């Protein structure tokens, strides 16, 4: 439940679609109240196997809407 470090680079296209390379922080402290679930259906490597992909997805979607 520490906000462990997760830096996740991304290589997307902007609105004008210049190749934009953006990294992001996932300052994740697993919800203490939800850790039962964060091990049932998330597991031991919760962050390494949850967070990078969602970061890439969200960042690409955001970048798609603004020119360089």
């Amino acid at each position: 439940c520490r906000s462990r470090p997760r830096n996740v680079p991304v290589i997307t296209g902007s609105k004008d679609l210049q190749n934009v390379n953006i990294t992001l922080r996932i300052l994740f402290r697993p919800v203490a109240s939800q850790l039962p679930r964060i091990f049932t259906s998330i597991g031991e490597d919760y962050d390494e196997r949850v967070l990078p992909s969602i970061t890439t997805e969200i960042l690409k979607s955001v970048v798609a809407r603004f020119d360089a």
Binding site: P36, F39, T40, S41, G43
Partner: protein, 75 residues
């Protein structure tokens, strides 16, 4: 090898009556403890280890959320 076990079992001293029943009770307790230990199964969480009913197949209705569920051995 069988004759060696023969001699080893034979050589057990012919003790008074009490220790014979004591050994029988000890064997009973050992078997019972082994059965009790085995009635639980390999269980990792993140694995809803459901009851596989011997009859009728999987228990389509017995959905084991996080919880004890003792497997009947060989069943």
């Amino acid at each position: 090898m069988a004759q060696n076990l023969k001699d080893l079992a034979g050589r057990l001293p012919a003790g008074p009556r009490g220790m014979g029943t004591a050994l029988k009770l000890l064997l009973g307790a050992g078997a019972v403890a082994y059965g009790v230990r085995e009635s639980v199964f390999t269980v990792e969480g993140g694995h809803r280890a459901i009851f596989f009913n011997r009859i009728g197949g999987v228990q389509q209705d017995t959905i084991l959320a996080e919880g004890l569920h003792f497997r009947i051995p060989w069943f």
